[PDB]
Design a protein around this nucleic acid. Structure first.
Lengths: 478, 186, 494, 348, 489
RNA sequence: UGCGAAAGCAGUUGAAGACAAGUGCUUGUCGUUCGUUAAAAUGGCCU
């Protein structure tokens, strides 16, 4: 169900008063509804059996009037966070409903008695019981100016009561269930709704006749109306809010809600609405974000479509980001470390992208790119065989041979000696063709870099040679 | 058609010009410890400790008094020596958003680190003769200043008990103590 | 603060012929099995469906090898003369084999006892039997009548269609993937003839001239086909009727082709070409049919195959040689009371509002030299640099890190003749390579500077110095020779 | 209504805690989720829930600072070598993983308690986290700094500890660490005097002791909302593997150094795994997680078990955690099925 | 021990120094707790809060010898993680700016001063600033073409600075030095981490190019030669860190430094190439090859000289046809396609080589028409289509020996949309006796593209180290007081 | 230190005062000034 038992906006709807149970004791809190801080102050009811039955704001000091179940009516000053005065009826029967008009405070007892108190003198002016009015639970004051002459009460059927005669002037057929809401929308019509009923009856207060019946999609919790009786908002048990736009002006017997408002979070959870507020072109809705935390939103109900859903952000599966941390989880003051990873490391000298002879097997291996036959050819070490093989080799295959020898010399450092005679004989025999062919550094890029590394290492080798000469000569003489 | 302006620049001001002190930090946490007040050479920056963002920046160029003190072209010796939470001159005030800035030449400025700046902040001067105030101390409503002076490259210290005269509307110093040839001090 | 940086291994500038990712993929086909058959393995085929077994044709025998065990699980030996081609349907339920007597025998794929169909296709040998890929009812047979015949499986008394116009020895055919009406036949006169079966079919709609006798035809796409014959293979476009590429990478005639795409690999499509010089090579159709990997076998490779794209298990590359060998290389693929006590651990927090994650993930273990460098133990790190079995790059990284911190002398302090010899024994090998030589020169020279007096006493250090002297002289000679060849190269280039 | 019936738990309820001043109940278990509920008795909704990845919850307590009442924390720990503090004033979650030289004595943070310490140099009160470790060690850390304040060592295999307070003057109090090993020997340390030993005594009968707990005053379960509200504890309870609970009246037991219990309760036959007192100390709740429905309520000072409750139809389950409300007189029992059932004592 | 502090109850001691490690000593049991690898040496420690729940440190980055780089670090006590860290810009000036003193250590190093060294070093630096002819306190700063973030190379790392927020985005190490692995103490402070001497962005902003010099330690055979590394980094616009894709060791040969880097126009390979020039007179072209997935050396112009000069500037035409290479006093026009000298078949009124009076400091090609050449004496505008010098100005009484070679490119920048030029001139303010004092003054002149008229003339009260063009109609300048200003419309 | 490519090429550290130690004498030191452009207190990095 709902953690909030009772709630009421003030007139002008700037603040909301609500009652919630804390462990076993009830408490009363007041929250501002406009976005532009939390109010931690609560009024705690010390007795566990003591409960709030009804509540009503007061329009010097703003206060809330709270009826209790012991028979006491407390005037609670919200700023001082204290109950200034407790009216008592003298009987231990719960206070069913209360209403105020100016200095007067009327209330109905659980034993169907009427009590009128006055605020300034702080006295019970009168109490009386009226015949045929039993099991009453709603009371409201019919506005006839500054003077109060008529009450409207409801058990399940509504009675209109003249105060000084103490008799029922007019009786209205209400609901099968007890009347839950009873309001005076204008001075010729009033509205009534009941517990577990989707219907609202609008009665003419003089004629006693039903003008219309307003129907909600679900059973009606709370009702609000604009001051002109030009719009009526109802929050229903399913948690939606329905607006009847211009209900009094006229298929004419029963009317359907003009607009419907729901609240759905981003993850898709439905958020119920309790206790909306309506005024001219403004509508304020309330819902509990945490377990017992009221949150509010203002809307312009004229501009919204007929079916409106408010999307609100809730924390569902939230990754707990930190201000001090980054996304990865490291400290923000921390420096990013140097990592190479899988970076290609290269040099600046890489200029890529810029009888008995074995010449037949060599040519076949070079055309087919055959490593085993190339090794079989390269195993031969006679200078005559190498020279005449390279001499009989075609000019075009000499470049491929130079590339393969460069790769083998680079990868295997111990073959640089034996393969250099092949390289030098290729350069000597096919020198003119190598002169004629262009892009020679790009074609012989591997050979150039392989020779560059070895040639670059020379001065360090010479220096180390000299130091080792010093040491060896010294211990040789010694 | 072209207009020069100085927009964005940062150098945290350090109390190292004295070079004899042990604690060189001027930045102060607020009383609720949600804001960190840091002096710069061009501004005073307030950071939210919880969100790590610069909430409010009191730039010297935007205010005439601050530009009159710190951004004088003739002398760059002006530097914020102490920042004190609250308003020193006004007693019995909460002063949650006010700070008091003491410079080396004795200027005392009362500023708001939240909300818009006052066009004419509360400005006073401590009567110092041939001295540079190196530090200011607060304890239970009592105030002292430690000032360096010269009568070896070593300087000397004078400790003055500082009071605020409400009637005279000025700060008054009384010579409590004196030390000479101070190498280091914590 | 900051987490400590891991020590980066020294990576020198890369050398020619580095390891290509395609090579890294294809060299995982490592385990090799050679099965001797009685005659030359002419055809190898794979089951298109699970479990992707493979059929091998030898003389008078068709064997089904299991992909799991690489052992023969079925044997078809009913054929009176030599059997030539064996193939599976697309659904894998039937196996067709062609005989030298002109018979085409269609068996159940896993039951050699039952013969569902037996067609007297020709009097001449039928060298090709294939099932239509799009249609499960059509069997295409190519024989030495120089006529290819499309048969319906239901009524196999007469050929449904006869395709002619070949002057010599059709011994390969293929079906274009998108178009079920097209049939490609490759013959020894060199012409690949494309037939539209909806037309008359006596004459091809067009022909493609591969100058050498066409050994095999395959279709790698709806538009592109690849034909091998001679030393090269040619890939042609069908809409343009022109060859896009030709690769003559081989010495001897290219015998077989296979194509496989979308299999788990760096390279999306692959074309396998096997020739008579013992070579089986991989080509990349996306990279202009360039050459990625190759295998050399003991003899002329008549047939080759690769396990299909949806193998979902071991992957095989299978080669059938003319000698009779079949070479297969593969790529491998608490009580209830206690549980109710401790059941909550496998939750991961789906229903919860906030999830907070600061859990520390385990890292790679630091090696001993890295730990010692972290704990500032320079001599211990130098000792850990030289240990048997340790990689030469890592033995270089320890020296480079100590040089970078400046701890050469600090690591070398307090060493005797016994502790000096691992460094010098490694320096003997370190002089030779180009990547380590300068660091070795630095460390050896610092050794000579610090411990030069102990040479006159210790004999073994003198032997190490003389050996390293000879190695240094050899490397100086190699460097001078390289500089001379560089000058010769400059004269030729300029 | 059951406390967690709105949002169910995925593990046994290893820990329950009530807020000192708010109608909030915190549940924790091995499913690594801390769940805070607003307790109405009729709706009992979920305020929030936080999942800690890789951190099971053996013990989690609300903490509220004695100086500043706006400083509210949740302290949470399991078998791991760290601890979590959630600032309840995006969540602000700090980790206490550093022991300032004593990691060898503290290998897990699972058994911890939070208490108040007056430093007496400035008469300032700060919270302390007391962690049980090996070799009879208890390491005491600052609750905000995380610094290692002190350490107290008892002899033998330490099984439990608890915190007692003793008022000295107006606005001054002392904190006593009461630690028990498995034999029955009980040490009392003065945390204000560098953790030196006030006294040592022996549990009469005393073998296989698992739990120790003071009651009747300000406990770690029910703390003070201000320094003047700090009271000493009238009762002490010692619970053993055998199912025996020896109950000592502190007013007579502080003198003897071999005291005699007021009563020895043998109503339960399995190991005592939960000892709790009411905020007034009129009820002692003793419970065992070994078997089903092993919870008993003991009236004090008569030392007599209640007869009508619990009942053969009471759905207690295997009681792993017990919490008493500070004010409302509620009893929350969390069991192995993940249910936290809630009852109200009508006297309170 | 540079910093000492106590806890409030006095049971703990906070200590910090040259090791970049913060220690908390338990004064009872003499056991300490470490927070190592901080961003700088600890010059101040404080415990903060009523319960000591914060640590406030002041950290100095002593790898920067030119300035005193302080970082203000507020630490949460429980986690020992930074609640706050506050910096300014961190530029590495060419020489040490006024009144900057190295901290005290045990011995006189490059990063530190000894006990005896401090009083002598203050006097020596002061009289150096008074007497010396050369006053170069210029830095190189980069502007990201996407983020408009300012990149300050800081020795072995790079600081990224959000200009509008006046804050720091990131601090990333880019070299393989000892870096943040340990805190150097005693003789270790004489080691030099690799220095990032050039950093550039491609026009798309997808690639960052860094040139660095790695210095060897002393007392070795290899202590003389220097390693030069060219690195190519990329990142996505989501993440903040850069990733090293390509590393080139000795890109212009062994021990040949890179003097100038110039990223390519968009027409040249979608702005994914660069052009690097060395002091032997050699050019190399690097381009991103997607098939290799790396940067490749695509074109080479051999040095082939015995002529060595650090006065190297480059310009590139927007269509990419021509490269203007100024090396020492010569200036050559190169066709990009041949990557050789420009030769015309007509060979009439087209000279590809310009010989000038002094060494070229800057070459700026404003449009395809106008070419600014700044020499050691004069600043000239040449119209390439006309082949004629429009006008020349005398820079000699301002730039006479003040700056080193190639440091006036930091001071001259150019607008690309409107063609305006910014030039900054620094003058030392002299005393009435005639001795030049410490104080400086700076003047910024905004010229037309033809240099005919001065659109703007501004004075600023401080030395200006770097002026650059923000990529929309703005000029950002950096002082030596680490302030940043804009001279724009 | 000045200039210069990295190589290099030229150039340079003087006084005064005070103190300490040894024995008026000798030597060293400098949180000293003026003039020139000019190693070492068993002491190693968190979870």
């Amino acid at each position: 169900d709902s953690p909030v038992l009772q709630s009421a906006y003030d007139p002008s709807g700037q603040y909301l008063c609500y009652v919630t149970v804390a462990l076993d004791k009830q408490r009363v809190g007041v929250q501002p509804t406009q976005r532009a801080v939390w109010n931690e102050n609560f009024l705690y009811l010390e007795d566990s059996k003591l409960k709030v039955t009804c509540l009503k704001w007061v329009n010097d000091t703003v206060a809330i009037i709270l009826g209790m179940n012991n028979g006491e009516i407390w005037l609670y000053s919200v700023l001082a966070n204290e109950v200034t005065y407790k009216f008592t009826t003298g009987n231990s029967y719960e206070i069913k409903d209360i209403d105020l008009m100016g200095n007067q405070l009327w209330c109905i007892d659980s034993s169907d008695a009427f009590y009128q108190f006055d605020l300034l003198q702080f006295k019970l002016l009168q109490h009386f019981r009226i015949n045929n009015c039993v099991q009453l639970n709603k009371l409201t004051i019919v506005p006839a100016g500054d003077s109060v002459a008529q009450l409207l009460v409801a058990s399940h059927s509504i009675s209109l009561i003249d105060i000084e005669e103490k008799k029922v002037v007019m009786t209205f057929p209400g609901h099968v269930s007890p009347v839950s809401t009873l309001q005076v929308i204008t001075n010729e019509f009033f509205i009534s709704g009941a517990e577990g009923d989707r219907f609202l009856n609008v009665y003419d207060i003089h004629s006693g006749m039903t003008k219309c019946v307003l129907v909600a999609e679900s059973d009606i919790k709370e009702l609000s109306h604009s001051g002109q009786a030009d719009s009526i908002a109802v929050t229903t048990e399913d948690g939606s809010l329905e607006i009847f736009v211009d209900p009094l002006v006229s298929g004419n017997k029963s009317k359907k809600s003009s607009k419907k408002i729901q609240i759905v979070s981003k993850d898709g959870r439905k958020v119920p609405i309790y206790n909306a507020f309506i005024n001219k072109d403004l509508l304020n809705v309330s819902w509990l974000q945490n377990a017992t935390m009221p949150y509010f939103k203002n809307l312009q109900w004229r501009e919204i479509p007929n079916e409106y859903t408010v999307e609100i952000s809730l924390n569902w599966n939230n990754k707990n980001k930190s201000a001090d941390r980054d996304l990865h989880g490291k400290d923000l003051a921390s420096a990013t470390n140097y990592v190479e990873g899988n970076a290609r490391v290269t040099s600046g000298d890489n200029f890529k992208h810029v009888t008995g002879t074995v010449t037949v097997i060599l040519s076949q291996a070079l055309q087919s790119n055959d490593h085993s036959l190339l090794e079989t050819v390269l195993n031969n070490r006679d200078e005559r065989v190498i020279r005449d093989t390279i001499f009989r080799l075609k000019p075009a295959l000499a470049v491929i041979l130079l590339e393969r020898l460069a790769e083998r010399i680079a990868r295997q450092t111990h073959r640089q000696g034996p393969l250099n005679v092949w390289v030098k004989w290729c350069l000597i025999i096919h020198g003119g063709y190598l002169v004629s062919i262009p892009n020679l550094m790009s074609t012989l890029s591997s050979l150039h870099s392989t020779l560059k590394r070895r040639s670059d290492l020379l001065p360090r080798l010479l220096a180390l040679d000299a130091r080792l000469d010093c040491t060896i000569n010294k211990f040789k003489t010694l | 058609q072209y207009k020069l302006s100085v927009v964005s620049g940062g150098k945290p001001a350090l109390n190292n010009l004295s070079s004899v002190t042990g604690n060189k930090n001027i930045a102060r946490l607020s009383q609720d410890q949600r804001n960190y007040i840091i002096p710069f050479n061009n501004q005073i920056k307030v950071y939210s400790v919880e969100t790590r963002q610069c909430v409010k920046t009191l730039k010297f160029a935007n205010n005439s008094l601050l530009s009159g003190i710190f951004l004088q072209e003739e002398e760059n010796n002006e530097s914020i020596v102490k920042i004190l939470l609250g308003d020193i001159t006004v007693p019995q005030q909460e002063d949650a958003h006010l700070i008091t800035v003491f410079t080396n030449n004795g200027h005392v400025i009362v500023l708001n680190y939240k909300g818009k700046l006052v066009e004419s902040p509360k400005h006073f001067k401590i009567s110092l003769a041939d001295e540079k105030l190196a530090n200011v101390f607060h304890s239970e409503g009592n105030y002292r200043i430690l000032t360096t002076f010269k009568d070896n490259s070593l300087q000397s210290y004078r400790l003055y008990a500082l009071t605020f005269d409400d009637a005279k509307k000025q700060f008054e110093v009384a010579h409590q103590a004196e030390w000479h040839n101070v190498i280091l001090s914590n | 603060s900051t987490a400590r940086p891991r020590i980066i291994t020294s990576k020198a500038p890369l050398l020619p012929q580095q390891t290509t990712p395609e090579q890294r993929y294809w060299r995982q086909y490592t385990s090799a099995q050679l099965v001797k058959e009685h005659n030359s393995v002419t055809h190898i085929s794979f089951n298109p469906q699970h479990p992707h077994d493979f059929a091998v044709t030898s003389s008078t025998r068709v064997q089904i090898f299991s992909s799991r065990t690489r052992q023969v699980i079925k044997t078809f030996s009913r054929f009176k003369d030599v059997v030539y081609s064996a193939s599976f349907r697309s659904d894998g339920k039937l196996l067709c084999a062609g005989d030298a007597t002109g018979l085409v025998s269609v068996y159940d794929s896993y039951n050699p006892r039952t013969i569902l169909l037996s067609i007297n296709a020709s009097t001449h040998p039928t060298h090709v039997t294939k099932f239509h890929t799009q249609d499960n009812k059509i069997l295409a047979t190519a024989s030495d009548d120089r006529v290819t015949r499309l048969w319906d499986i239901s009524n196999a008394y007469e050929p449904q269609l006869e395709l002619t116009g070949a002057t010599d020895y059709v011994r390969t055919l293929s079906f274009i993937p998108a178009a079920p009406h097209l049939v490609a036949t490759g013959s020894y006169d060199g012409l690949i003839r494309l037939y539209d079966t909806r037309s008359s079919g006596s004459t091809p709609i067009y022909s493609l001239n591969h100058d050498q006798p066409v050994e095999n035809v395959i279709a790698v796409s709806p538009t592109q086909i690849v034909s091998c014959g001679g030393n090269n293979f040619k890939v042609w476009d069908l809409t343009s009727n022109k060859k896009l590429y030709e690769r003559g990478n081989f010495n001897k005639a290219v015998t077989c082709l296979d194509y496989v795409e979308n299999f788990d690999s760096p390279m999306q499509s692959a074309l396998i070409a096997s020739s008579l010089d013992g070579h089986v090579k991989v080509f990349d159709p996306l990279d202009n049919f360039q050459v990625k990997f190759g295998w050399k076998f003991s003899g002329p490779v008549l047939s080759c195959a690769v396990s299909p794209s949806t193998a979902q298990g071991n992957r095989h590359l299978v080669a059938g040689l003319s000698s009779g060998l079949l070479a297969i290389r593969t790529k491998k693929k608490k009580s209830n009371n206690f549980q109710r006590m401790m059941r909550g651990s496998e939750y991961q927090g789906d229903q919860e509002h906030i999830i907070h994650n600061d859990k520390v993930r385990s890292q790679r273990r630091m090696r001993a030299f890295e730990r010692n460098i972290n704990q500032f133990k320079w001599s211990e790190a130098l000792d850990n640099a030289f240990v048997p079995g340790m990689a030469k790059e890592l033995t270089l990284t320890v020296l480079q890190e100590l040089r970078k911190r400046g701890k050469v002398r600090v690591a070398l302090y307090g060493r005797d003749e016994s502790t000096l010899e691992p460094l010098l024994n490694w320096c003997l090998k370190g002089i030779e390579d180009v990547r380590s030589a300068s660091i070795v020169a630095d460390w050896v020279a610092v050794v000579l500077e610090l411990y030069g007096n102990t040479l006159e006493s210790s004999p073994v250090l003198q032997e190490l110095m003389i050996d390293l002297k000879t190695k240094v002289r050899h490397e100086i000679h190699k460097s001078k020779e390289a500089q001379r060849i560089e000058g010769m190269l400059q004269l030729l280039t300029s | 209504k059951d406390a967690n019936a709105s949002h169910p738990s995925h593990s046994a309820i290893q820990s329950l805690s009530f807020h000192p001043s708010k109608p909030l109940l915190l549940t924790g278990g091995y499913d690594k989720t801390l769940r805070i509920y607003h307790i109405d008795g009729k709706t009992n909704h979920l305020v929030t829930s936080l999942h800690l990845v890789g951190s099971p919850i053996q013990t989690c307590t609300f903490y509220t600072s004695l100086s500043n009442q706006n400083q509210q924390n949740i302290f949470t720990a399991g078998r791991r070598r760290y601890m979590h503090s959630w600032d309840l004033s995006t969540a602000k979650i700090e980790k206490f993983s550093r022991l300032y030289g004593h990691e060898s004595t503290q290998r897990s943070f699972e058994n911890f308690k939070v208490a108040h310490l007056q430093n007496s140099q400035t008469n300032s009160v700060h919270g302390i986290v007391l962690l049980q470790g090996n070799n009879g060690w208890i390491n005491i850390l600052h609750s905000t700094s995380g610094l290692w304040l002190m350490g107290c060592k008892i002899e033998g295999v330490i099984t439990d500890f608890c915190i007692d307070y003793q008022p000295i003057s107006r606005g001054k109090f002392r904190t006593i660490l009461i630690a028990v090993n498995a034999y029955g020997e009980v040490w009392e340390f003065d945390l204000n005097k560098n953790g030196h030993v006030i006294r040592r005594w022996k549990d009469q009968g005393g073998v296989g002791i698992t739990k120790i707990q003071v009651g009747g005053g300000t406990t770690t379960t029910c703390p003070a909302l201000q320094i003047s509200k700090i009271k000493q504890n009238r009762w002490l309870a010692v619970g053993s593997e055998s199912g025996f609970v020896n109950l000592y009246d502190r007013n007579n037991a502080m003198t003897s150094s071999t005291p005699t219990p007021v009563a020895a309760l043998d109503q339960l036959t399995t190991t005592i795994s939960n000892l709790q007192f009411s905020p007034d100390g009129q009820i002692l709740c003793m419970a065992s997680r070994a078997v089903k429905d092993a919870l008993r309520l003991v009236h004090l000072p008569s030392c007599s078990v209640f007869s009508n409750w619990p009942t053969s139809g009471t759905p207690l389950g295997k009681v792993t955690s017990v919490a008493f409300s500070p004010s409302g007189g509620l009893l929350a029992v969390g069991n192995e099925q993940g249910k936290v059932r809630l009852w109200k004592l009508n006297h309170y | 021990v540079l910093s000492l502090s106590f806890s409030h109850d006095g049971s703990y001691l906070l200590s910090g120094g040259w090791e970049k490690v913060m220690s908390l000593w338990q004064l009872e049991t003499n056991s300490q707790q470490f927070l190592p690898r901080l961003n700088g040496i600890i010059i101040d420690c404080q415990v903060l809060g009523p319960q000591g729940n914060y640590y406030s440190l002041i950290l100095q980055m002593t790898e920067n010898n030119s300035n005193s780089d302080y970082q203000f670090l507020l630490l949460n006590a429980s986690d020992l993680t930074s609640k706050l860290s506050i910096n300014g810009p961190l530029p590495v000036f060419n020489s040490t700016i006024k009144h900057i003193q190295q901290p005290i250590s045990a011995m006189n190093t490059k990063n530190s001063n000894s006990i005896t060294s401090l009083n002598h070093s203050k006097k020596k630096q002061s009289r150096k600033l008074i007497k010396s002819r050369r006053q170069d306190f210029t830095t190189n700063v980069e502007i990201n073409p996407i983020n408009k973030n300012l990149y300050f190379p800081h020795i072995s790392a790079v600081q990224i600075f959000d200009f509008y927020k006046n804050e720091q985005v990131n601090y990333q190490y880019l070299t393989s030095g000892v870096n943040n692995s340990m805190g150097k103490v005693r003789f270790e402070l004489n080691l030099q981490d690799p220095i990032i001497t050039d950093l550039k962005f491609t026009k798309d902003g997808q690639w960052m190019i860094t040139y660095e010099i790695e210095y060897p330690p002393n007392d070795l055979l290899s202590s003389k030669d220097l390693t030069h590394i060219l690195k190519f980094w990329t990142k996505n616009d989501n993440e903040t860190n850069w990733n090293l894709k390509t590393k080139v060791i000795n890109p212009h040969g062994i021990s040949v430094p890179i003097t100038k880097i110039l990223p390519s126009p968009r027409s040249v390979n979608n702005s994914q190439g660069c052009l690097t020039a060395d002091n032997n007179g050699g050019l190399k072209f690097w381009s991103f090859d997607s098939h290799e997935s790396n940067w490749c050396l695509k074109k080479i112009s051999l040095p082939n000289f015995n002529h060595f000069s650090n006065s190297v500037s480059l310009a590139w035409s927007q269509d990419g046809s021509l490269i203007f290479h100024g090396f020492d006093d010569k200036l050559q026009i190169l066709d990009f396609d041949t990557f050789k000298k420009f030769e015309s078949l007509e060979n009439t009124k087209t000279v590809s080589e310009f010989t000038l009076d002094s060494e070229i400091q800057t070459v700026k090609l404003i449009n395809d028409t106008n070419l600014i050449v700044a020499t050691r004496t004069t600043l000239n505008a040449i119209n390439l289509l006309r082949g004629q010098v429009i006008n020349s100005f005398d820079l000699y009484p301002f730039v006479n020996g003040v700056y080193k070679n190639g440091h006036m490119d930091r001071l001259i920048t150019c607008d690309e949309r409107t063609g305006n030029i910014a030039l900054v001139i620094n003058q030392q303010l002299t005393d009435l006796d005639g001795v030049p004092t410490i104080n400086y003054k700076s003047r910024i002149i905004i010229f037309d593209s033809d240099l005919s008229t001065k659109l703007g003339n501004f004075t600023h009260h401080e030395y200006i180290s770097w002026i650059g063009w923000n990529y929309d109609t703005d000029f950002i300048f950096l002082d030596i007081e680490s302030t940043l200003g804009v001279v724009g419309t």
